[PDB]
Enzyme design. Structure first.
Site, PDB file in Angstrom:
ATOM      1  N   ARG A 150      -2.074 -11.188   1.122  1.00  0.00           N
ATOM      2  CA  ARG A 150      -2.785 -12.186   0.311  1.00  0.00           C
ATOM      3  C   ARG A 150      -3.340 -11.524  -0.951  1.00  0.00           C
ATOM      4  O   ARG A 150      -3.138 -10.338  -1.144  1.00  0.00           O
ATOM      5  CB  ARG A 150      -3.916 -12.819   1.122  1.00  0.00           C
ATOM      6  CG  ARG A 150      -4.536 -11.893   2.149  1.00  0.00           C
ATOM      7  CD  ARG A 150      -5.130 -10.674   1.493  1.00  0.00           C
ATOM      8  NE  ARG A 150      -5.748  -9.765   2.450  1.00  0.00           N
ATOM      9  CZ  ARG A 150      -6.587  -8.793   2.104  1.00  0.00           C
ATOM     10  NH1 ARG A 150      -6.908  -8.612   0.829  1.00  0.00           N
ATOM     11  NH2 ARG A 150      -7.105  -8.001   3.031  1.00  0.00           N
ATOM     12  N   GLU A 184       0.850  -1.164   0.000  1.00  0.00           N
ATOM     13  CA  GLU A 184       0.000   0.000   0.000  1.00  0.00           C
ATOM     14  C   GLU A 184       0.897   1.228   0.000  1.00  0.00           C
ATOM     15  O   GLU A 184       1.970   1.208   0.609  1.00  0.00           O
ATOM     16  CB  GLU A 184      -0.863  -0.012   1.260  1.00  0.00           C
ATOM     17  CG  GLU A 184      -1.849  -1.170   1.348  1.00  0.00           C
ATOM     18  CD  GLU A 184      -3.253  -0.768   0.904  1.00  0.00           C
ATOM     19  OE1 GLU A 184      -3.992  -1.637   0.364  1.00  0.00           O
ATOM     20  OE2 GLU A 184      -3.612   0.424   1.089  1.00  0.00           O
TER      21      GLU A 184
END
Ligand SMILES: O=CCCCC[C@@H]1SC[C@@H]2NC(=O)N[C@@H]21
Ligand SMILES: O=CCCCC[C@@H]1SC[C@@H]2NC(=O)N[C@@H]21
Lengths: 106, 261, 261
Positions: B56, B40
């Protein structure tokens, strides 16, 4: 080296993984709660098991040990947690290992 | 709550996006990451910051498959089997040759009534048509011409995703499925995604995280009369319960009147 | 019969296809060509031959769209207006910005029966399910709900195209997708199609238009024990015509005392 794959999850992503698994000639196991009786995803896998008689809401997809129950009982070589439930659970990841079930993920 | 995702970014500069993807391989190279993983970041100009890491797959992987042609999920299953990502089972093009071809957009069609502050609605689905055609990807979820969605779970009927050489092509084309869609029985959020899809501030590609709060003209007036539904309903009433006035028999045979013109 | 189309060519070397293109482009700009057009070559060794031109779209244009990310039929229309190729509207890249990312295959799902001479089948469709997900593209034809297909036109139910970075990967994608389809009430060509996909000699890439003729075993087609269908036939039959020695009563399973275990 994976012959049979289970998905600890529901909806689009179980379906997404099942399609992926088929591409790879790997059998698939799905799992469903009670109120997921008539979910699409349950019908898209080679095989499908209820996760326990008694579990209600989401609690049915978060039960580490009972999912492993189904996993062992069905000769599964790997679990894909998908996203959103135990995908990010160390317990689940760890316990998979101990039992010779490959956790798919890091 | 992530509403809509774009691959790759837009307007956001080509060096900037380079140093961000660099930085991504940095963190993950350093700690020997294994499998699928989202790094992110947060972008303020020629300046970004780390936020978190999802270890994931994601909902919006679709997007990245469509602009690079890599099945992420199938790859996950081969990694966990032992695959070299540069062996013959994955066919990973070396990092230097991995490209994006055009722009793709995803939006998950849910049963959130935008007329009721996005309360998940439930029940039977008794009419269902998706779309298809040119660079339109469909990932079915809960939705089928049959049965029902319960309050217990993330409502998500369909993942819908589109792809073109230019962003604006993909936006049109995403709009055009959202409309073909024909769900009946449970209200949904399509009407709100259409207005997102067709917002000027969208195409221009320079949209902030507060995109939504500073645009009240997204939650907007049209419930939709059930045009042909109300009609099937009249017809079905008369047919079963007669028409109050009129010898309740079957529909009489009628001489075909050619109609002059 | 064009049966299975692939893009681009697996079996050609770089410098061959580059010349095979160059030639086509030579023809088309030499005579002013406008809109979509196809130039056909026959290929033997390191020598093309010009065979025909197809002055429109062909069924398998989708396969090109998938690897160039350029919408052919869209542009056709934009061109007819008067728009330019490299302008805002079409946003066509310049000739050397155009590429393939990946490989795509096209299959046309017909009611042509393999066991019976490829002879179009007729009638109402009693079950229809399709595909979706990674790499799958679907263009609606005659199939749905409960269409009757007639003997009057080319039977084409669905156009199915798949797309991945590896050619093998696109194949094993095709076979997933083919195996998902349910079409019921008519015979289809799915199994034959499955049977070309699976073939080493098509996976090898090195295949000639002599393929189907010198591979007799493409026609080796077992129908599997489609439990589901059969069981509905049986239940239907008994429900309507009852059982031999057995009198028509209200159906038992009438103690909610289930079963010790
Ligand atoms: O008898 C029940 C079926 C529904 C009847 C409604 C039609 S509308 C025109 C006519 N005038 C009425 O008030 N009712 C029938
Ligand atoms: O005509 C009655 C309906 C057909 C029922 C068929 C079942 S199959 C087992 C048993 N053997 C028969 O000849 N008929 C019944």
């Amino acid at each position: 080296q994976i012959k049979k794959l289970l998905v600890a999850n529901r909806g689009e992503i179980a379906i997404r993984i099942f399609r992926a698994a088929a591409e790879l000639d790997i059998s698939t196991v799905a799992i469903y709660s009670n109120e997921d009786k008539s979910s699409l995803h349950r019908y898209k896998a080679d095989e499908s098991y209820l996760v326990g008689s008694d579990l209600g809401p989401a609690e049915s997809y978060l039960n580490i040990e009972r999912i492993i129950d189904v996993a062992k009982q069905a000769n599964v070589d790997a679990i894909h947690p998908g996203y959103g439930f135990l995908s990010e659970n160390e317990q689940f990841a760890r316990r998979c290992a101990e039992e010779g079930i490959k956790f798919i993920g890091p | 709550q992530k509403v809509v995702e774009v691959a790759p970014s837009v307007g956001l500069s080509p060096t900037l996006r380079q140093r961000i993807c660099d930085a991504a391989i940095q963190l993950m190279e350093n700690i020997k990451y294994v499998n699928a993983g989202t790094v992110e970041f947060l972008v303020s100009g020629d300046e970004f910051f780390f936020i978190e890491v999802n270890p994931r797959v994601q909902v919006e992987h679709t997007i990245t498959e469509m602009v690079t042609g890599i099945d992420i999920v199938k790859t996950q299953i081969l990694v966990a089997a032992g695959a070299d990502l540069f062996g013959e089972e994955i066919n990973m093009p070396q990092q230097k040759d991995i490209t994006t071809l055009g722009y793709a957009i995803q939006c998950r069609i849910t049963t959130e009534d935008p007329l009721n502050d996005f309360m998940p609605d439930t029940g039977t689905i008794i009419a269902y048509r998706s779309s298809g055609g040119a660079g339109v990807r469909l990932d079915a979820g809960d939705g089928f011409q049959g049965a029902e969605i319960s309050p217990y779970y993330d409502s998500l009927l369909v993942k819908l995703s589109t792809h073109a050489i230019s962003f604006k092509q993909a936006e049109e084309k995403m709009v055009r499925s959202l409309r073909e869609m024909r769900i009946r029985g449970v209200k949904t959020n399509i009407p709100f995604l259409i207005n997102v899809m067709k917002n000027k501030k969208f195409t221009s590609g320079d949209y902030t995280t507060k995109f939504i709060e500073e645009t009240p003209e997204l939650f907007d007036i049209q419930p939709s009369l059930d045009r042909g539904t109300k009609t099937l309903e009249y017809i079905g009433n008369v047919t079963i319960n007669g028409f109050p006035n009129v010898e309740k028999r079957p529909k009489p045979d009628y001489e075909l009147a050619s109609i002059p013109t």
